[PDB]
Design a protein around this ligand. Structure first.
Ligand code: MG
Ligand code: MG
Ligand code: MG
Ligand code: MG
Ligand code: MG
Ligand code: MG
Ligand code: MG
Ligand code: MG
Ligand code: MG
Ligand code: MG
Ligand code: MG
Ligand code: MG
Ligand code: MG
Ligand code: MG
Ligand code: MG
Ligand code: MG
Ligand code: MG
Ligand code: ZN
Ligand code: ZN
Lengths: 87, 120, 25, 97, 81, 206, 129, 217, 96
RNA sequence: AGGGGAUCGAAGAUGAUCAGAUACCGUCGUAGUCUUAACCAUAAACUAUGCCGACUAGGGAUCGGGUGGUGUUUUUUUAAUGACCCACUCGGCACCUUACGAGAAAUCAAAGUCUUUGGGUUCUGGGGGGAGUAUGGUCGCAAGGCUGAAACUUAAAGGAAUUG
């Protein structure tokens, strides 16, 4: 939210649900951010380095947290099958 | 009725928590402990207390008592931990269902077979 | 008083005014 | 306000049932609102059964109960029979025992 | 649920649905060629006949009507198309 | 991103089928599960263990990722999981909660039960719902062992299981632990059946 | 009986978004639905959409992103007198800097900003933001 | 002395988190009031209303006191706390703290041109609580706060310069009205305009970057 | 839509319906029925001048106990009779 | 207006009860209760919730219809039937669990998709009394139905829930 002349104004640009791209606001204390570990050759899990996803309180309440994570991580490569885009 | 108030039952807890070494199945010495190690305004209230920190001690020696945990249990429990020498690959092969093996066939590789059927 | 007896009260009352007024038709 | 979804008692998809007469006070009450018990009991009783067979021809006989349905009227159902009056939640419970 | 392919439904879950609730609608009744070896030809019956379809030449029967699928007459045979 | 040898091996598969970790819930069957695989007739639904295995891996791949391994929390109010969780927490970092939960453990700093983790693992979101609820008052992600009739609100990444008892829950936890150690960790190489017995995890007696 | 075929198409889209979905089937589509769908799309408020041809009135699959608060229809298609356009946008848009009143005019189905630029007016269809 | 309990209280006292915008960035649940004291010290309070309530009891009437309180700077951080104790001051004390805990952010915008420093709202917003709906509408400069004394004061401490308001409901019940106005300005950072359509990489959580530098003992 | 027409040509129905329902307005109906001019001791006018017939001592309603000094007045343009209050302490002594 | 008139039974008369008891309880029992031909048009005529259309969420029962099965059971010689079991699908009468959502709440798959306020349409309400009264019209054999005011009076009447 820029201003008159190029200057960035209004503090704080909120995160977004990786799943629904809606804002995750402050009092949304039911939301979640899953850090998933980048790993290297022959197991081993490279500490401090994650593939990360966020998830709105809405979504988790509606029980869609597990299906939605599935699709998300799989089209990154951390799942191999499991999720069908058809029904 | 001789049901002990909370002040007594609470003080026993607190004592058995943090002085379990010292304290004994014996009231008489549990009595004396409570003087040196705690401040109580009446002989009667201390007796009352020591008699019950004694009771709690006596049945601890025969299995835990909920409320009181001096950590030492949780580590006796972790060392009191092991079993097995058999496991549950004998004998022969894994007995499966028609579709259990379909799951096998359609996903993976080699597994010993053993068909079933079942009805209504 | 119970609504229905009051409804009955005024039914009675109308039949009365209905009467008295006919004395002068 | 409204105090039950069954309202009085049990009538959704009709409009009019048909009154029964209360077994105790004779009060008419719709059949679906009735409140009912099967009075099944032996003709004899706890005591007479021994004394029954004893002073009888036949080996132990057979024995027949009496089977008759009861229709109570809420007031009559409350005043003695099946009633208590239950808490706001217990009222929901349709399980018998 | 929450994200799925409305454009490419699985054939199975498309198969269980109602005929007007598939993606594009079509019937689920078939036609058949039907014959009783007394004769040498093949009449074509509709799987839900309503009319008690009488054979070409011989007043025989072929299928009685029902609630839905016509019941074909006991000693016969058929193919779908 | 796929590891390469982290495919489901025939030794793990045998472990699982003997554990009946594929024998899913009967008539009951929560809409939110295509972890299924062909209705075995007369009630039982068969659970696709491949998917099971991957989830477990992703699970482990998120557990190891927590900086301090001891603010990973394991839960199990069901007796059939108490020996497991203690044995999971034993080997890895992880603080355990076996038996009764005690509400106010995540809200309410004032309690003596007070935890405050960065992740929660749970064995049966029916029995342990106290915790699943509690954690979504306060932004904790949740990993959970789920059958075909488990609630799935407020639990990300389900591990399709068989909380019908026995060895399943014990297996899954053992496999969980086994993988979090094979990850940035105190283990080994390829096959490597691991020293520790899988029957170590398991409800006792009688 | 179906009075506004547009009205169903918007409320469908609206209920999808609200429930966190990423697509909707809509039925039965129309020239007008398409053009309304087209405007929203041009402005980012939905993704791509596909017209499936039942041999009938059409179905549509919309793919929506989640930038969408509301897409509403205006039930009588009131005439707007080009000067009245200000009064509509104000009545029913969240601020003066984003969001659109979309409406039907002799020069095509177009949002009010294009309407302003082309200097035409007409009747009011609905809105997006 | 402070002695924080909670991970967040430690990280904050230990100078590892500098502003609540971070807290809101990651939606960190706040339990310790001292947190929002050190993180935002220009906070000035304001008792909004005090009223007697009464409870009937199996041995006495019980009339304790309900106090409604607003804290804020005048720079996009409000807090609305409601507390009832049996002495007035104790109600106010506990009320100010609750109000500090609930301190939320305000997105303010421009009535409709880019100029110098936001002065109004991003969008219209609505807040409901009970029967009352407080509705907030962006206004041109020097319009002022067009609102009742109470709601105006909550909107000033919140940092807003010009806004329009409309209310529906039994607005005389102050508790519900302010709560609705609160929820109304709370809603401004939930509303997705296109200026916020741009994708952000997804920041890492302080609770993990200073993982060690938090931690119990 | 619950209950009003929404159509583009339902303007008449919408006006009539309003007209019909204005009669539930207490002020509106008095305005059009001409209640002022018809009943009501003044014409509909702000004041009226009358003649003092007798001095009354009206006993006050509960929970109040008092004698409220008043006057019966016959309106000049009217002959309509009216009782009126005589405000403040004494002041009944000022009439006759 | 005819028939019928077992039963129960407004009215009436009685026995008790009661300070009284025109009642509650008991007895006698007229009309009535049933039927034909005609009237009447009202019920808390109730889900106190207009109709048509769309969309939004889970579960097990059940009624009707249909489809699928090397299902069960019926024996005869296997079938065909039938009844039953499983899966699905239309359309019903309902219940369960949830609530994204709604509400003043009780509660509600509508009472949701509403100040981010518009799918179509019918109807009714606008503080409480006065009063469903007065008056006119109209229908009715009657009882009464429909339509339906004001003057004046009044600061509350009222709803849901909470504690006593
Ligand atoms: Mg005469
Ligand atoms: Mg009440
Ligand atoms: Mg009542
Ligand atoms: Mg009826
Ligand atoms: Mg005041
Ligand atoms: Mg009226
Ligand atoms: Mg006089
Ligand atoms: Mg008779
Ligand atoms: Mg009598
Ligand atoms: Mg007498
Ligand atoms: Mg009499
Ligand atoms: Mg009526
Ligand atoms: Mg009813
Ligand atoms: Mg349903
Ligand atoms: Mg069949
Ligand atoms: Mg008064
Ligand atoms: Mg009460
Ligand atoms: Zn009775
Ligand atoms: Zn033939």
């Amino acid at each position: 939210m820029e201003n008159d002349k190029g200057q960035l104004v209004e503090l704080y640009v909120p995160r977004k649900c990786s799943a629904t791209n809606r804002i995750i606001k402050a009092d949304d204390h039911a939301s979640v951010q899953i850090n998933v570990a980048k790993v290297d050759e022959e197991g081993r899990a490279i500490p401090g380095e994650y593939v990360t996803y966020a998830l709105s309180g809405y979504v988790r309440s509606r029980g869609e947290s597990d299906d939605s994570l599935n699709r998300l991580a799989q089209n990154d490569g951390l799942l191999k099958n499991v999720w069908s885009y058809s029904r | 009725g001789r049901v002990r108030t909370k002040t007594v039952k609470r003080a026993s807890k607190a004592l058995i928590e943090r002085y379990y070494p010292k304290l004994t199945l014996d009231f008489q010495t549990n009595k004396r402990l409570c003087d040196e190690i705690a401040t109580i305004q009446s002989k009667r209230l201390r007796n009352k207390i020591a008699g019950y920190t004694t009771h709690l001690m006596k049945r601890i020696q025969k299995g835990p008592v909920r409320g009181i945990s001096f950590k030492l249990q949780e580590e006796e429990r972790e060392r009191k931990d092991q079993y097995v020498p058999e496991v549950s690959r004998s004998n022969g092969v894994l007995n499966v269902d028609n579709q259990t093996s379909d799951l096998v066939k359609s996903l993976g590789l080699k597994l010993p077979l053993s068909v079933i059927n079942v009805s209504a | 008083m119970r609504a229905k007896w009051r409804k009955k009260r005024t039914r009675r009352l109308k039949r009365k005014r209905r009467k008295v007024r006919a004395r002068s038709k | 306000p409204k105090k039950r979804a069954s309202n009085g008692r049990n009538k959704k998809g009709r409009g009019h049932v048909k009154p029964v007469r209360c077994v105790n006070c004779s009060k008419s009450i719709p059949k679906d609102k009735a409140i009912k018990r099967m009075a099944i009991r032996n003709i004899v009783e706890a005591a007479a059964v021994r004394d029954l067979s004893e002073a009888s021809v036949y080996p132990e006989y057979a024995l027949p109960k009496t089977y008759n349905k009861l229709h109570y009227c809420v007031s009559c159902a409350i005043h003695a029979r099946i009633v208590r009056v239950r808490s706001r939640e217990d009222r929901k419970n349709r399980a018998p025992p | 649920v929450l994200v799925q392919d409305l454009l490419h439904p699985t054939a199975a879950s498309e198969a269980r649905k109602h005929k007007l609730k598939t993606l594009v609608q079509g019937p689920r009744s078939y036609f058949l060629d039907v014959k009783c070896p007394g004769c040498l030809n093949i009449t074509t019956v509709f799987s839900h006949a309503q009319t008690a379809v009488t054979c070409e030449s011989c007043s025989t029967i072929l299928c009685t009507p029902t609630g839905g699928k016509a019941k074909l007459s006991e000693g016969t045979s058929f193919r779908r198309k | 991103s796929l590891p390469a040898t982290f495919d489901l091996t025939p030794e793990d598969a045998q472990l699982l089928l003997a554990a009946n970790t594929h024998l899913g819930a009967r008539n009951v069957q929560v809409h939110q599960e295509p972890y299924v695989f062909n209705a075995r007739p007369d009630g039982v639904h068969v659970i696709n263990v491949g998917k099971t295995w991957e989830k477990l891996v992703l699970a482990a791949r998120i557990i190891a990722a927590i900086p301090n391994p001891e603010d990973v929390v394991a839960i199990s109010s069901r007796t059939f999981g108490q020996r497991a969780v203690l044995k999971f927490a034993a080997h890895t970092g992880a603080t355990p909660i076996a038996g009764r939960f005690t509400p106010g453990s995540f809200t309410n700093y004032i309690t003596r039960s007070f935890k405050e983790p960065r992740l929660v693992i749970v064995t049966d979101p029916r029995s342990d719902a106290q915790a699943i609820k509690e954690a979504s008052y306060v932004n904790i992600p949740v990993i959970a062992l789920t059958d075909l009739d488990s609630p799935s609100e407020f639990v990300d990444v389900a591990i399709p299981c068989n909380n019908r008892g026995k060895h399943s829950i014990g297996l899954i936890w053992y496999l969980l632990a086994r993988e979090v150690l094979r990850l940035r960790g105190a283990l080994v190489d390829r096959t490597q059946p691991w020293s520790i017995m899988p029957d170590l995890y398991f409800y006792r007696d009688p | 009986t179906r009075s506004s075929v547009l009205a169903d198409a918007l409320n469908a889209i609206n209920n999808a978004e609200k429930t966190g979905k990423r697509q909707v089937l809509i039925r039965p589509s129309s020239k007008v639905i398409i053009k309304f769908l087209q405007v929203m799309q041009k402005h980012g408020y939905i993704g791509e959409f596909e017209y499936i041809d039942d041999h009938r009135s059409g179905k549509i699959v919309v793919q929506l992103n989640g930038r969408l608060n509301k897409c509403g229809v205006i039930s009588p298609r009131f005439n707007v007198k080009i000067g009245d356009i200000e009064k509509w946008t104000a009545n029913l848009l969240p601020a003066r800097q984003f969001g659109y009143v979309i409406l039907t005019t002799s020069a095509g189905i177009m949002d009010h900003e294009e309407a302003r630029r082309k200097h035409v007016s007409g009747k009011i269809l609905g809105f997006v933001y | 002395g402070w002695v924080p309990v909670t991970k967040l209280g430690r990280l904050v006292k230990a100078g590892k988190i500098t502003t609540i915008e971070e807290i809101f960035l990651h939606s960190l649940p706040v339990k310790e009031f001292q947190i929002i004291d050190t993180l935002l010290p220009g906070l000035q309070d304001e008792v909004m209303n005090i009223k007697p309530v009464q409870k009937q009891t199996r041995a006495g009437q019980r009339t304790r006191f309900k106090a409604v309180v607003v804290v804020g700077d005048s720079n996009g951080h409000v807090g609305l706390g409601i507390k009832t104790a049996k002495e007035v001051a104790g109600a106010i004390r506990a009320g100010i703290i609750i109000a500090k805990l609930s301190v939320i952010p305000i997105r303010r915008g421009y009535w409709g041109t880019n100029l110098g420093q936001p002065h109004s709202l991003a969008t219209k917003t609505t807040g409901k609580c009970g029967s009352v709906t407080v509705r907030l509408i962006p206004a041109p400069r020097g319009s002022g706060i067009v609102a009742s004394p109470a709601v105006k004061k909550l909107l000033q401490l919140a940092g807003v310069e010009d806004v329009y308001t409309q209310s529906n409901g039994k607005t005389r019940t102050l508790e519900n009205t302010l709560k609705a106005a609160f929820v109304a300005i709370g809603n401004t950072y939930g509303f997705l305009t296109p200026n916020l359509w741009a994708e952000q990489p997804l920041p890492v959580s302080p609770l993990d970057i200073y993982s060690d530098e938090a931690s119990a003992q | 839509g619950k209950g009003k027409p929404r159509g583009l040509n339902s303007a008449r129905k919408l006006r009539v319906h309003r007209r019909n329902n204005r009669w539930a307005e207490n002020n509106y109906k008095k305005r059009l029925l001409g209640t002022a001019f018809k009943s009501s001791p003044f014409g509909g006018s702000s004041h009226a001048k009358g003649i003092v017939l007798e001095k009354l001592g009206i006993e006050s309603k509960q929970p109040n106990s008092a004698i409220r000094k008043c006057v019966r007045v016959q309106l000049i343009k009217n002959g309509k009779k009216v009782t009126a209050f005589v405000p403040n302490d004494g002041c009944l002594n000022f009439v006759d």
